[PDB]
Amino acid sequence: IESIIKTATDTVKSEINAELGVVPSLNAVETGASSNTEPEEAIQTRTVINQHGVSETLVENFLSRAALVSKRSFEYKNHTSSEARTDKNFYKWTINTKSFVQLRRKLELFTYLRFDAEITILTTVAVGSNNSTYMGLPDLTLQAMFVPTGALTPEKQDSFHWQSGSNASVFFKVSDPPARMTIPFMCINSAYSVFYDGFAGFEKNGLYGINPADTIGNLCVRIVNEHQPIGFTVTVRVYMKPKHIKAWAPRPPRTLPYMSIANANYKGKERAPNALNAIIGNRESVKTMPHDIV
Amino acid sequence: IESIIKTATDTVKSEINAELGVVPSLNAVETGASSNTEPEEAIQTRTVINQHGVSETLVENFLSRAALVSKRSFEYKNHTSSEARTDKNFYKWTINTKSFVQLRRKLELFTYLRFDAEITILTTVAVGSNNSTYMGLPDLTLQAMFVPTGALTPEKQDSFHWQSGSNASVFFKVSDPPARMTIPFMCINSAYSVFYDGFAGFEKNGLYGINPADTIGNLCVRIVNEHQPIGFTVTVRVYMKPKHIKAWAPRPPRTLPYMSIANANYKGKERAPNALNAIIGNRESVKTMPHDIV
Amino acid sequence: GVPTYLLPGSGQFLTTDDHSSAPVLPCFNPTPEMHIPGQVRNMLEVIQVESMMEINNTENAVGMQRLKVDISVLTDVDQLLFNIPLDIQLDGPLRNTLVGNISRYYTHWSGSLEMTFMFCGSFMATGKLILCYTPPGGSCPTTRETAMLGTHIVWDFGLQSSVTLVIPWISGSHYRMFNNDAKSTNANVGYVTCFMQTNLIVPSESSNTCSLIGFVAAKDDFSLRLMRDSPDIGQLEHLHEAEAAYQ
Amino acid sequence: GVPTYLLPGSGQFLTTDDHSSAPVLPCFNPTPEMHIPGQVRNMLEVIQVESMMEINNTENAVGMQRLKVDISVLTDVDQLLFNIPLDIQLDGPLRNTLVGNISRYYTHWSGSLEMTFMFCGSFMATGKLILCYTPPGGSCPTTRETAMLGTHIVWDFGLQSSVTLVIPWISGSHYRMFNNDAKSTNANVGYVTCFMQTNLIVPSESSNTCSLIGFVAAKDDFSLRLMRDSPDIGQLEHLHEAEAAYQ
Amino acid sequence: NQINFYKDSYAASASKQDFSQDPSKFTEPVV
Amino acid sequence: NQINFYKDSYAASASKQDFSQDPSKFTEPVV
Amino acid sequence: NQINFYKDSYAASASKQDFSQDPSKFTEPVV
Amino acid sequence: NQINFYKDSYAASASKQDFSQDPSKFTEPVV
Amino acid sequence: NQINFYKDSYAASASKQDFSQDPSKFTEPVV
C-alpha cells in the first residue's frame, strides 16, 4: 500500500543469510502470492540501483493504444435500386469492445474499466470491382452519429434521422485527418463491466453477458454526399483508444481464440498451442527442453 | 430561488415520520408542482451523497447540439439553358428553425430563445445520375451570403448581388473543413419567439406565426465557380448549433408529427403512438402491463 | 505556434463541439436582454414540474379520456385500479410528460420520480387509494398484498385531494439506460400499481365513475446523460413550406 | 499563433498518440466513481501475482494434467524431474501465466522472476527438491551437478509446502527482447531445472505419483517496454455476432 | 479553455457554465 | 504538455501519470 | 483577441473600437 | 510579433528594425 | 523554441545544445 513508485525497485546487497527459525523462500501459496524478495534468500544479490521503465507499462499506457474496433467496408452506389440486407450507403454499428480480438483481449484482462473512448475514424475509399476503373478517389464527407443504445437509429442514407439536433454527430472528409472524437464514459454504472455474469432483462429469456450499460452506443456512419454514378467501397475503420483508464479486478488473459462478439464462448485450435485441451504447444516430455542451446 | 447547484441534490436519512397534523405527500396540484421530497414521506430514505451529472442536461448543453436545418441538394450544370423553377446553381433559403423536426422540437420546448446561431455548412458533391460516370469530385468554392429578411436576394449565380460589400458572406471549399460561422442574435426583440400568437403585418391578411423578427435571415448559397461540363448534385447541409442559449417559458414537447414549416398545424399518425386522438400507443386496459416481466 | 501538426480530429464537424467560430457581422451589438419571466438555464427546472401521465392508454379512451383514469365504485375489495409502467424513456403512460419526452432526448437518466395523483371526483366522493411502486425483477403485481411489499402509500382523499408517491432511486447502477428493451435490468424501473384500499364510496347523486389524474415529475436528485435524438418526433418526408422557404 | 506551418507528422493517425480530442456531448457529467475493489493502475500489480506454469506440456497430459507436474517415487537419485524454459515472451510453460501473457504485450522486459512451487502431495509425502535456474550460454542441464552451479535452491516440503526460487536478473543488457528466437543472447533467459535431492518418499497408503504445481510471478523490479500486439490471440476471420452488431 | 480570438462576445464558446437554476419559477409559482 | 482546450474534463489527454500502485491488493490479500 | 503576429501595424485586425464620435461636426456646424 | 520557434538564429523573421544608418560613410567620406 | 507538447521526454526537439566536449578521451588517453 501507499506506493507511488515511479521506477522498478532497486535490490539491496545480500550476504549469507543462513538464519535458523526464519526462511523467506518458504511461503504459502494457499494465502496468495509470495513475498520472498531477491535479497531475502536464494541469491546473494548486489546493490543495483534500478532505474527501469514503469510509465510504459502503466495500465493507462497499456490500454491507451488506438486499436481497431470496427472495420466495415460498405459499398457506395445506388443501394436503393436493388439491395436487400447490405449497408445502404450507411451502417449502424453497435459500439462493442469485442469486435477485434486484440483490443478485446486487452480490455478483457480487467473485469471493470472506467474510460472515455477516443474514437478515431479513419475512412478509406477504394473503387469497387464492378467498375474496374480508377477515375479518381472522391472527397466524401461522412457523418458518424452516436445514437444511445436502444434509441431510434436511421434506416436510410437520407432517413431524416441524420439532422443530429440532440444526437452527437461528427462530419469528416476522407481527404482530411481522421475523425478524432471522445465518447464519454457514459455507463450507468461506475465502470464498463467488460464481462457480465448476468442477463439484460428481468425476464429469463435475456442474453447472457450483454449488459446494455456497458454497451457504449451505436455509431451510425453514413455518406453525407449523395450517390455517385461510380460505386465506391468505403472501408471505414473505427479505432477506439481507451483513455483515462481506471481498471478493476484483473483477470486471466483470453487464451483460446474468440468465437463470438456477444459471449465468451471458447473453442481452441485443432492442436496446441491455444487449444481447448492444451493452451501451450506441447513438448516431448517434462524432461525435454524445446529450443535448447546445442 | 438562488440555487447555483452543480450536481443532483443529495437526500438525507429519513426515519419514521408519522406525525399528526402535518403530511408532506398530501399536496395541492391546484397550486403547482408539489414540494414533497424523498426524505419527507412515503420512503424511509438513507443519506446517499448525489454526485450525478447536471452539466450535460443544462439548457445550454441541451440546445448546443449542431443539428440539421437546411439539407438542399441542387444541381450544378447549365441551369440557364433550360430550367424553370429549380435552383440555378444557387438557392436562397429563408433561415428558419423549423425545417427539420428534431431541432425544431428541441427549440420548440421553449417559447423564447436568445441564441447566436453557429451555422456550420457541410457541403457534399455527388455526380448526378444523368452523367453516370464519376470523373473525379471537383473542388467547389461556395458563397453563403446572409441577407437580412426582406432585403434584395440574388436571382442568378452571377447576379451581381454576390459582391457582399455590406452583406456578410463566407467562401468555403468542399475539400475543406465545413464553414463554421456565428450568425448573431439579430432579433429586434430580446429573444426569438419560437412560437408567435400573432400576425406579421398590421393588415388582417398576414401569416400566422411568422414574426419577421424571429426569422433569422436568408442564406443565399451559390457556387462561386462557373459551370462545369459535368453536372454535380451539390447537397449543402446547413447545421445550426444554437449557442449562448437563454431560454424562457418552457412548453410541452411537440407530440404529433409536424406538417408545415410555417405553422404548428397537427395531424397524428393513423394509429397510436403520436396519433391525434392518442399520443401514446394504446394498452389493452388500465390493468394491463405492457412488457411485463414474465 | 509556427510548428503545428494536425490532429486526427482536425477538419471534422462534430455536432457537440464547442469551439468558437467566426462572426459574420464584425461589430454586431445585439439588442439588450430584458427580464423575460421564467429563465430556463437547466432542464431540471422543467423536469420537476408535474405533467399528466396517459394512465388510461386504451383504444376506447379517445383524447381527454386518456389523461385521466376512471375509477369506479367497486362492489368488492382488492382489485387493481391501474398499473403504470415507469419506462420514462420508452413508449408508455410516462412518455407523454415533461420528464418522459425530455428524458427521451437522453439515453441515461437517474433520480427519484415524484408521481402526484389528484382525485378529480366530487367532494362527497370518499375513498382510499393504495399506490405501490414495485422495484424491478419480477412481474407486475395484480394483487395488493404482493404490491404493498414495495414502496406503497395509502391516500385518503379528504381536503387536500392529491398525493405524491415518490418513486425512489433504487438501482444497481448509478443511471438507467434507454437501450430499447423494457425487460432489461438497467432499463426496467418498476411498476406503479394502484389499488383500492377501502373502496371508493360516492353518494347516489354524485357520479359513480369518478376520475383520477396522475402526474409524474421528479425531484432535484434527477439527472440526465448521453444526449440522443428523441424518437417522439420523426421526419420521413420534407414538410410543408419546406421547398417553399427556398423557392 | 496565426503563422502556423504543418509538421511532417501532422494529419497522421498515430495509435499511441495522446493529444486531446473533441467531446461529443458538450456537457456530459459521467457517473461518479465508487470504490470498486482492486484498482489497477499499473501492470506490475498484476505481474507480481503468481500464476500456474504449464510445466507438464505433454500430449498425454490433457488440460488439468498440464498445470501440474507428476513427480513420482524414483528408485534412483540424480534424475531430472523437469526443466522449464524461461522464455516469458515465447511459447512455453511460462507463456500461459499473468507474467507471460502480459509481457507478450511488450517486446522488451526486465526484472527478477519469482517462481513458487507448491507441493501438492500428502502431508506424509516427504522429499527434497533442488530447483536450479541456469544462466544462458550453454545447454539445459540434465544432470544435477551441472545444475547446482547456477542459482539453485534446496527445498524440504515440511509444513510450509511451497518454495520460491527467485530467478535473478543477470543479463548483459538492461532488458531482454522478444525477437522470435529463443537462442539469442538478448532473448534466452536460462533454464529452471528441478531435480530430486534426497528422493520423494511416500507411504504405501499415500499416492506414489505425487503432484507439484509451479507458478511464476515477478517482483517489483520487473519492467516492460516496447508495447506490441500479443500473439496469444489472433483473428483470421470476423467472429460470430460481428456483422450482426451491424445488420 | 476558451480560444475566442474574435472581437465579438457573441462569437465565443458555448458557455456551458450557467449552473444557476431556479425551479421554483415553474414548480412552485405560488405565494 | 496538455493542449486540452475543450470544456470537458473527459476530453483531456491520456493521463499517463497515475504512478501510484498497490500490488498488495492482489499479491498479498491476507491479514 | 488580436493575433497580429506580423511586423506591420497596418496588417493588424480591423480595429472596431473607435467608439469616439463627434456628430456636432455635421449636425451643428455653427458658432 | 516573432514566431521563431526553431533553434537557429538565422531562421528568424526578417529583422526590419535596423533603423540605424550612417549616410556620412557615402555622402561625406572626408576629413 | 521548443514546442514539445507531448508527454514523453524522448519526443522532444533534437537537443543541439550539448556543447560540452572532452577531446582528451580520444586525443590524449594517457596518464
The CA distance from G1 to the nearest CA of chain E, in Å, is: 4
> Which of B62, E16, A210 lies closest to C225 in space, CA to CA?
B62
Phi-psi region of C214 (alpha: psi -120 to 50; beta: other; left: phi over 0): beta
- Identify residues of B whose CB sits under 8 angstroms from chain A CBs: 62, 65-69, 71, 73, 100-106, 122-127, 129, 131-137, 139, 174-175, 177-178, 233, 235, 237, 239, 293-294
In this structure, are residues C4 and D4 in contact, taking their beta carbons and an 8 Å threshold? yes
Residue of I nearest to F3 (CA): I5
Cα distances from E22 to residues B2, B53, C97, E14, E19, in angstroms, run 7, 17, 20, 21, 10
I6 near F CB under 8 A: yes
For chain A, which chains pass the contact test of at least 3 CB pairs under 8 Å?
Answer: B, C, D, F
Cα–Cα dist A32/D215, whole Å: 11
Cβ-based contacts of E14 with chain F (< 8 Å): 7
Asked if B61 lies within 8 A of D27 by C-beta distance, the reply is: yes
CB A143 within 8 A of CB A170: yes
Query: CA nearest C3 in D: which residue?
Result: D5
Residue D35: how many CB atoms within 10 A of its CB?
7
B202 is written with which cell numbers? 398590421
3-state secondary structure of A42: coil
**Residues of chain I found within 8 Å of residue F5, distances taken between Cβ atoms:** none
CA angle centred on D146, ends D143 and D149, rounded to 5°: 140
Spatial separation of the C-alpha atoms in residues D41 and A244, rounded to whole Å: 11
B-chain CB neighbours of A228 within 8 Å are 126-127, 134, 137
> Rounded to an integer, what distance in angstroms lies between the CA atom of residue D165 and that of residue D153?
6
Q: How far apart are CA A187 and CA D97, in angstroms?
A: 31
In the block, residue with C-alpha cell 453514413: A222
- Give the nearest partner residue to F16 out of A60, A182, A241, using CB atoms: A60
Among the partner-chain residues B67, B136, B178, the one whose CB lies closest to the CB of A164 is: B67
Residue of D nearest to F13 (CA): D20
Q: Which three cell numbers stand for residue F3?
A: 493542449
For Cα atoms A250, A252, A253, give the angle at the middle one, nearest 5 degrees: 105
Neighbours of B47 (CB within 10 A): 10
Q: Which residues pair with B3 in a beta bridge?
A: E21
Chain F residues in contact with chain A using a Cβ-Cβ cutoff of 8 Å = 8, 10-16, 18-24, 26-30
Place of cell 457534399: B124
- CA–CA separation, C89 and C108 (whole Å): 9
d(CA C27, CA G16): 7
Residues of chain D contacting F14 with CB distance shorter than 8 Å:
18
Residue of F nearest to I9 (CA): F1
Interface membership of D247 toward C (CB under 8 Å): no
Check if F21 contacts I (Cβ < 8 Å).
Answer: no
**Spatial distance between the Cα atoms of B61 and D23, rounded to a whole number of angstroms:** 12
Rounded Cα distance, B118 and E14, in Å: 10
Q: How far is F1 from chain A (nearest CA, A)?
A: 16
Whole-angstrom Cα distance, residue A6 to residue A21? Answer: 35
Put simply, the answer to whether A105 touches D91 (Cβ < 8 Å) is no
> Grid coordinates representing C146?
404482493
As a whole number of angstroms, the distance between CA E7 and CA H2 comes to 22
Distance CA B280, CA A12 (A): 75
User: Do the two chains G and A touch, given a threshold of 8 Å on CB pairs and at least 3 pairs?
Assistant: no
List C-alpha distances in Å: A88 to A8, A158, A159, D247: 54, 10, 11, 11
Q: Are D217 and D112 a contacting pair, CB within 8 Å?
A: no
CA distance C27 to C24: 9
Spatial distance between the Cα atoms of A66 and A238, rounded to a whole number of angstroms:
9
Residue D37 phi/psi, 5-degree rounding, is -70, 150
Note whether C98 and B255 are within 8 A (CB). Answer: no
Say if residues C160 and B31 touch (Cβ distance below 8 Å): no
How many residues does this entry show for chain C? 247
CB of B161 closer than 8 Å to CB of B154 = yes
Residues on chain C touching I3 (C-beta within 8 angstroms): 1-3
Find, among G22, G21, G1, G23, the residue nearest to G13 by Cα.
Answer: G1
CA angle A7, A12, A18 (to 5 degrees): 140
I26 inside 8 A of chain D by CB: no
Backbone angles phi, psi at E9, to 5 degrees: -70, -25
Q: How far is CA C193 from the centre of its chain?
A: 16
Q: Of E2, E21, E25, which has the smallest distance from its Cβ to C20's Cβ?
A: E2
Q: 3-class DSSP state for residue D7?
A: coil
**Chains C, D: CB contacts under 8 A, how many?**
67
What are φ and ψ of residue C103, in 5° steps? -75, -20
**DSSP string covering D162-191:** EEEEEE----SSSSB--TT-TTSTTT---E
**Nearest partner of D82 among D97, D72, D90, D95, judged by Cα:** D72
B69 neighbors C85 (Cβ within 8 angstroms): no
DSSP symbol at B209: S
Residues 6+ apart with CB under 8 A from C180: A149, A150, A151, C90
Q: Could you tell me which residues come within 8 angstroms of residue D192 by beta carbon, excluding any fewer than 6 positions away?
A: D83, D84, D86, D115, D131, D132, D133, D134, D165, D167
Q: Is C98 helix (H, G, I), strand (E, B) or coil?
A: helix
The whole-angstrom separation of Cα B43 and Cα B40 is: 8
CB contacts under 8 A, D 34-73 vs C, are: 34
> What is the C-alpha separation between C214 and C84, in angstroms, rounded?
10
The C-alpha atoms of residue A215 and residue C184 are separated, in whole angstroms, by: 13
Question: Chain G window 6-25: which residues touch C at a Cβ cutoff of 8 Å?
Answer: 14, 16
Q: Give the burial string for C71-89 (b: 16+ CB within 10 Å, else e).
A: bebeeeeeebbbbbbbbbb
Resolution (angstroms) stands at 2.6
A124: three-class secondary structure by DSSP: strand
- Cα–chain-centroid distance for residue A229? 37
Strands (E), chain D: 5-6, 22-23, 39-40, 69-71, 80-85, 106-110, 113-120, 128-134, 151-156, 162-167, 191-196, 210-218, 223-227
Question: Which amino acid is it at C173?
Answer: S
The DSSP letter of residue F9 is G
**Integer Cα distance of D233 and C232 in angstroms:** 44
Those chains having 3 or more beta-carbon pairs within 8 angstroms of chain D are A, B, C, E, F, G, H, I
* Contact: D4, C1; criterion CB under 8 Å: yes
Q: Decide: B186 and B213 in contact? Cβ < 8 Å.
A: no
Q: What is the DSSP letter of D176?
A: B
- Residues of F with Cβ-Cβ distance to C18 under 8 angstroms: 6-7
C-alpha Rg value of chain B to the nearest Å: 26
Method: cryo-EM
Residue H11 DSSP one-character state: G
- Residue I6 with chain D: CB contacts under 8 Å: 17-19
Closest CA–CA distance from residue H2 to any residue of chain C (Å): 10
Length of chain F, in residues = 31
Cβ-defined contact of B55 to D29 (cutoff 8 Å): yes
Which amino acid belongs to residue D52?
A: M
Cross-chain Cβ contact E23/C44 below 8 Å: yes
State CA A193 to chain mean position distance: 13
Nearest CA in chain I to F16: I7
A 10 A CB-CB count for A127 gives: 18
The chains in contact with chain C, meaning 3 or more Cβ pairs closer than 8 Å, are: A, B, D, E, F, G, H, I
